[PDB]
Each structure stands twice: as C-alpha cells, then as structure tokens.
C-alpha cells in the first residue's frame, strides 16, 4: 500500500498517482508513489556464463 | 434596548454617513478600454510630411526628395492588491449595532467588506485617470513604471497663463490665442473645429465668473443661460458654463491643485486609452484580463473567513502635446 | 451554446468519499472487509435470498420484437447468441453481475466470435461475457480517468491475476454499480452502513457466550482449619494428607442423587465454626442490560439494508429484487445488443429495436388468474390469439 | 441531502439517423455539489434580486469558472422561492442525530 492514510493497512495498487489545487487558483502538485519488491523464487534454474575472448 | 440595570429604553435609528465618491471623468467616457493577455504593450507611430522646392535652372541639376520617420515604444503594468481577514473575536460577543438584540453576524461584516473594497477599487480607478491626464501614470512606491509621457514620447508642457486682477483685460482672449492656435497647430491630422473642454478648480471657476466682462457680456437682454438669475448647471453639484464656443466644468473632487486648469480638445483619436492585464492566478494566467477580480474563502476548520481582491491596469496619454496648463494668478 | 462549461469530477467526488469512510471499508481494504463479513449467518442469508429471486428472473428470460418484419428476424438472432453462449448461460451471468451488492462494483468483459458452421454462418456471436473479480482488480487504482477528473478511459487488472499456484479499454467493458450518483465510478456497497451496527452485533454475542460460562451460581465451597491443610502439604505419608487427597476428589464428584449428603464436624473456636459448607450466590443484584434486545435490534439493522428484515417475525423484498435487475438489464439491453447488431450490420430505426425482458419473480395465482380470464371473456374485451391460448 | 440540485443543458448536432440537421441534447451533465464553490456558489445581480449563474471551483478541474443561469436547471427543496440554497430534510433530524449516536455509544461500554 502507498502511505497515505486512506489505504493503511488497505490494499495494494501497481502505481498510484494524485494531482493537487489549492483552490485558491494560485498553485498545483503532483505526487506518484511506488512499493514493490522482485523476487525470484528459485535461484537454482539461473546459471552464469562468463567468457574468455581472444 | 436595555438601560440601566432596573430601567429599560426605546431604540429609535441608525445614521450612516460615508465620503463623496466622484464619477465626472468615469461618466464623460474619455478613456477606452482595452484588455489584453500580458503585462507589456506596443505602440506604433508614423509621422509624414511635406518640405518646399527651390527653384533651379533649365536642362541643369535635379532636386531630390527626403525620408520618412518611424518610432516604436514599450511599456509595462503594475499590481494593485488588497486583502482582508475576519477573526472570531470580532462577532463572539458584539451586539449588530443594528436592531436592540440581534447577535452579530459574519455577513454583515464580509458585506461590510465588500462596500470597502468596491469603494478603494473605485477611488483608485478615479485618481488614475486624472494622474494620467497630468501626462503621468500613477504608480506609487512603485518606481519601475513611473512614466512620464512628456519625456517618453518628446514634447514640452504649454503653459497658457491667465491673470484674472485685470478687470479691463478679458481672460478669454489669451486662453484663445495661446491653447487653440497650439492645439491647431497640433492636431497633427487635417481636422477642423475641434470641441474644446476645461477642466478648472473651484477657485478658478469661480474667479472666471466674477470677472466683470464676462457679467457685462450677459447682463444687457436676456439671451439665454442666463448666469446672473439663475444658476450655472442647474441644482446639480457639478456647476457648468459655456461661453465663446467652450466648454468649463468645475472639479468637485479636488484633484486638480487649486487655481490650475487644464484645457485639451475632444474629438482626437486614441489619445487616451487604458488597458487591464490578467491577475496571478492560474485560472486567469495568460487569459482575457477583467475590470476586477473578487475573491472569498471559508475556511473548512470553522476558525477563519478571509477574502480576497486584487486588479492591474494602466492608463495611458498618446498625446501629451494636447494638455496646457491653466494657472491663474489674484 | 453547444460546449460543455464544466466537468463530471469524477475524480474528485472519488476522493473526498474516500476520507468520508472509516478505514477498514475504503477501496484496497473493502474487498477483505467483505469476505470477513458474510460468514456471519444473518449476512450470509440476506444476501443469498436476493440472488435467489435473481437468478429466477433472468431464467425464462424474452426478447420483444417490434413491428417490422425485419426487428422480428433480428429478434430471433439475438436469442440465438443470448442463449448459445460456449459455458455460459444468462443465470450464471446474472448471479455474476449482481454482485455489486456485496462490492459497489461489477466489471464484464465481452468477446465475439465467428461462427464456422450452422444456422448463421458467417455472423459474429458472443463467446463469453467474460467476468472480472473484484478482488483479481488493481488495488491502487482500480479505474483510470482521462488528464482531467472528467470520463473513463478504462480499467485496470493487477498483474499478479495472470499467475498459478493490463487496461482493458472501456469500449470492451459493462459497468454496474448501485447506490451512488453517476459521478461515483466505485459505487457504494449496501454493507456501508451496516458495519458499525455488524461490529457491535458481534460484540455483544461474544460477551453472552463468556458470560454464561462464568455465572458460577450455586457453587459449592468448603472451610477447612489451616492446620490439617499445611500438614498435609509437608507430610504427604500423614493422615491428614490422605483425607485431604479424599476431599479432592470427592468434591469433584459431588452431584444430586440418590444417596447425596454431607457430614461435616461441628466443632466451633470463635464467633465463626472451624468446618462450614455453604453455596455461593451473587450478594446483590444480576446484569441489567438484557443483551437479548441488544441483539434483535442490530439484526433488523442489518437486514433492512437489503430489504429482508421480514425474516425476523408486492413487498418490500419484491420491489427491491426489481432494483437489481433493472440495473442489469440497462447494461444487456443499451451495451451489448446495440453493439451486437452493428457487427452483423443489422442497423434499423429506433422504434425498431428489440430488447430483452427478464422473467417474472412471483408466481402466478391460478386462482386469482382464471377467474380474471372469465371476466374479461364473458364481456369480449379478450381477443382470439394464439398468444392468450398458450397462456393456458 | 443537501437542499440544492445543478445540472447543465448541452446540445448537438446530429449526423446520420432519422433527424438528420436538429439538435440532440447530448448529456444532462451532474454538476456534484462537492465539486461547487465553497464560498459563494451563487452568485447574484449588483442586488440581491435575481441569479446571475452559479459558480464552479477551480480545484475540480484536476486529477489525482462560473456557468450562466441560462444554461442551468436549478431544483430545490424546503424553502420558499427566495432561498437559493434550499432547507436540507437533514436540517431538523440533526439535532435528534447527534443524540440516538451518544446514547447508542453508551449501552455497549454499559454492556
């Protein structure tokens, strides 16, 4: 989940993005968070090749 | 209405009383109104004339023609903004002053707000248009317009004086000879009988008036407006008079400094002119600019209420060489 | 003038909805919330007697020609493709698409295909109306808006539904959704509302349960000299330990018989006896709050929500039932056949359109219908057709 | 639920079908009262005798103006003709909101 407090403890989402006015016509943001984390299960099936050239 | 601890009382009225807030300039619609989308400005002038030829011999030399003349200008606008806040303390425990009971209200106040804010926007806007007849833009504490038109686009100020302690000299016939031969002179296209207006504080006004020629002048057979029976303007607080194919009106407002006068014919095109820029919002950026902008805002909390007004524009004479100054001497 | 001066704000009405709701009910949580709820049996069983009228209105489901010759050809066309559907039927659909009573939200997907052989090659039927879980959605965001808060564009899936143990453009899409304004893409689930009441339902029951348990009422106590309990406790070959072993044991077993008594001895060393035997009892008074009423009340507050508080004695629960399938009929009828058709190029005027017409939900009186035919036919108001014959 | 209602008339042109060259409506466009001015949503004549249009905040044109009276159909509920922004039926079960809420509170901590 992103750390706003709407989602805390929520749910998860692959991108979140937010746009902000001040609304006093004079000002605007824009926000976008990610959290995830690459995980390969197996490192058992991935073999390294290095080579010797010339 | 509560008295004294034991007593009571009876709660008659209000009275409200405000300053005069003047519109002469505003109602003779001098100006035109432009509004444009940045805060710079151009202006084009193309000036073109004539010379003589002189005489040559037969079958010999030739004479040749001269060039024209061009010019181009800058300028830039100012910010004017005024702001306000309405706090809790100010209606926690304070009486309308209106009706014996009636608790304050923020209404009243932001409405209260509101008449002020118009009033100042509209009071500026006033004093504008008479700094900018002077041939000066108006732009206090703010020295980075400061535009003298008279130095700007080249000229020098007419003078026209008028002394008014010599009751056998009529005061008209310097005023003619001096304002309408320049004014001819420079009206710069090939126009006629242009309408000739003045501007005069009250004091000078005044003194016109009571010059004995002008008395004698209308004195004899009634004529019509008549000046000695009945009143100049009528009822109206704004006196008006007209002799000798002119035009005098009396300034109320006070801008003018007293005695001076300031004499400048009709009819010109594009001598004065006024533009608006757009305000610092994103809503307006870079968009069509408006006479004013008015802002209000409640705070989401319940602790605070404020509101908000801010205008920019400039005023502009293209002509400067058009203006005489008046000054009268007693 | 024709332009638009404004915008849906879709994307904002969203936004201040979602700090409007206690935490454990926005978006991302609102899926687990669900599940967790139902296994309450009121909650279950509220839900379950709607889908059960449901699924028996879209069952003997009717398509309704109109006048041309052409509308009727189409019209069989489109019962064809409804009803031919590769593993689907319209009751599976319907007990799918109803469920945005549970999440404020359903999303199908419709595919087509060809046909390669039988009554009419070479048009286009619809294979799946493929249904999207909810909880298989993208929780972050689960729909994407245009740069502004104005329209949709499409929806999102999460990525980790394509594995075993992406947008879909929203021209693909049939959206439902019930208990909000058209400017609320995540509709309101009907358990809004309810969860403050489920929360304290629970509660309550739970505190009866220990309660119960702990009302030791009656229980028998026994008062015995100090002196032969510490001499047992350090000489346990002392016969003050083998009447104490005795004790424990008996005690336990001490219930209401036929040879039930009690001998104690009498002995006395102060105001108060050395050996007593009495049963307890609350010195002063019970509970007050009668937690039964508690529960009854926050039981027809959840059940009203979804018009099936009757259980706790045209209807309430029958009007409601029409809610539902109207909503899933304006979907089938305004997404699909128009669409359906243009594939086929059946394109025809507005009065010609056919449409679909869900089933009846409450059975026919054979009473109350036979006698009204004969009052009717006893005057000729009723015209001679096969179509009032075969109602027989 | 909150007194006042605003929806916006657009028109368009029609292409093909049977009314080839009139004009549709296209939508019956919800203008969302959150998504109003906070600070004046309707905005008046120099007096307070008529309605000039209504008023849109800025900060819905953003993701995560004022529009003529003529363009607008306005409804309203519980008040006369010259209360613009009308009673809610919410106004009046307040009061009695707030109470059943703390009393209900009260039976479970007494539980």
């Not at chain 2, 006033?126 to 008279?150: E, F, H, I, Q, R």
């Not at chain 3, 398509?63 to 009727?72: F, L, N, W």
Request: glycine share 6%; aromatic share 8%; net charge negative.
């Amino acid at each position: 989940p992103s750390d706003t407090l709407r989602d805390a403890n929520q749910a998860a989402q692959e991108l979140y993005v937010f746009f902000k006015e001040s609304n006093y016509l004079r000002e605007a943001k824009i926000e976008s968070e990610t959290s995830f984390l690459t995980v390969n299960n197996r490192p058992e099936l991935v073999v390294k090749s290095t080579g010797k050239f010339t | 209405m509560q008295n004294g601890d034991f007593q009571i009382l009876d709660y008659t009225g209000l009275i409200s009383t405000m300053p005069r807030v003047d519109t002469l300039l505003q109602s003779m619609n001098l100006f035109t109104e432009h509004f444009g989308r940045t805060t710079v400005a151009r202006i084009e002038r193309l000036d073109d004339g004539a010379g003589d030829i002189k005489a040559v011999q037969r079958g010999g030399v030739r004479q040749h023609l001269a060039n024209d003349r061009k010019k181009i200008v800058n300028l830039n606008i100012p910010f004017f903004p005024l702001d306000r806040s309405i706090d809790r303390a100010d209606i926690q425990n304070f009486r309308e002053f209106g009706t014996e009971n009636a608790p304050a209200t923020v209404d009243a106040e932001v409405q209260r707000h509101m008449a002020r804010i118009r009033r100042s926007h509209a009071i500026l806007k006033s004093k504008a248009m008479y700094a900018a007849l002077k041939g000066t833009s108006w732009s206090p504490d703010d020295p980075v317009s400061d535009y003298n038109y008279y130095d700007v686009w080249g000229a020098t100020q007419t003078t026209a004086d008028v002394d008014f302690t010599k009751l056998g000299v009529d005061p008209i016939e310097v005023l003619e000879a001096e304002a309408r031969a320049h004014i001819i002179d420079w009206a710069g296209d090939n126009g006629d009988n242009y309408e000739i207006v003045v501007l005069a504080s009250r004091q000078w006004f005044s003194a016109l008036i009571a010059h004995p020629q002008v008395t004698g002048a209308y004195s004899q057979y009634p004529s019509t407006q008549e000046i000695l029976r009945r009143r100049l303007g009528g009822n109206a607080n704004n006196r008006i008079f007209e002799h000798k194919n002119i035009l005098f009106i009396e300034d109320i407002s006070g801008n003018i400094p007293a005695g001076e006068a300031y004499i400048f014919p009709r009819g010109i095109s594009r001598m004065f002119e006024i533009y608006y820029a757009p305000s610092d919002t994103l809503r307006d950026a870079n968009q069509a600019a408006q006479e004013l902008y008015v802002f209000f805002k409640e705070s989401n909390y319940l602790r605070e209420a404020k509101i908000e007004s801010e205008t920019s524009f400039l005023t502009v004479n293209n002509r400067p060489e058009l203006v005489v100054k008046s000054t009268g001497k007693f | 003038r024709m332009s638009e001066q404004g915008t849906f704000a879709l994307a904002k009405v969203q936004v201040d909805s979602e700090r409007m709701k206690a935490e454990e009910i926005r978006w991302p949580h609102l899926i687990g919330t669900a599940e967790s709820m139902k296994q309450d049996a009121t909650v279950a069983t509220g839900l379950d007697m709607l889908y059960t009228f449901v699924e028996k209105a879209f069952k003997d489901f009717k398509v309704i020609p109109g006048e041309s010759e052409e509308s009727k050809k189409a019209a069989k066309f489109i019962e064809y493709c409804l009803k031919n559907m590769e593993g689907q039927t319209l009751r599976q659909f319907a007990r799918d698409a109803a469920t945005f009573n549970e999440y404020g939200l359903s999303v199908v997907e419709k595919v087509y295909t060809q046909i390669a052989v039988g009554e009419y090659v070479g048009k286009y039927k619809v294979k799946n109306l493929a249904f999207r879980p909810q909880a298989s959605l993208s929780r972050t965001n689960p729909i994407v808006y245009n740069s502004d808060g104005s329209a949709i564009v499409g929806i999102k899936q999460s990525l980790s539904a394509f594995q075993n143990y992406v947008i879909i453009p929203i021209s693909r899409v049939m959206l439902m959704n019930t208990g909000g304004s058209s400017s609320q893409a995540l509709g309101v689930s009907p358990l809004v509302g309810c969860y403050r009441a489920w929360r304290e339902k629970i509660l309550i029951e739970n505190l009866e349960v220990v309660g119960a348990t702990k009302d030791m009422g009656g229980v028998i106590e026994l008062k015995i000299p100090s002196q032969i309990l510490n001499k047992a406790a350090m000489d346990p070959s002392s016969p003050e330990a083998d009447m104490v072993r005795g004790l424990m044991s008996d005690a336990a077993n001490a219930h209401s018989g036929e040879q039930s008594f009690f001998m104690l001895p009498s002995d006395t060393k102060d105001n108060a006896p050395q050996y007593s035997m009495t049963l307890k009892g609350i010195d002063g008074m019970g509970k007050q709050y009668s937690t039964a009423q508690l529960i009854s009340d926050r039981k027809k507050s959840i059940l009203d929500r979804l018009g099936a508080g009757f259980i706790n004695v045209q209807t309430i629960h029958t009007q409601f039932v029409q809610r539902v399938n109207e909503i899933i009929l304006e979907a089938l009828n305004e997404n699909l056949l128009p669409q359906l058709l243009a594939l086929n190029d059946i394109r025809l005027p507005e009065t010609e359109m056919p449409y679909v017409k869900a089933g009846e939900i409450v059975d026919v009186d054979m009473e109350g219908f036979s006698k009204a035919i004969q009052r009717i036919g006893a005057v000729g108001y009723l015209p001679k057709t096969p179509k009032v014959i075969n109602r027989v």
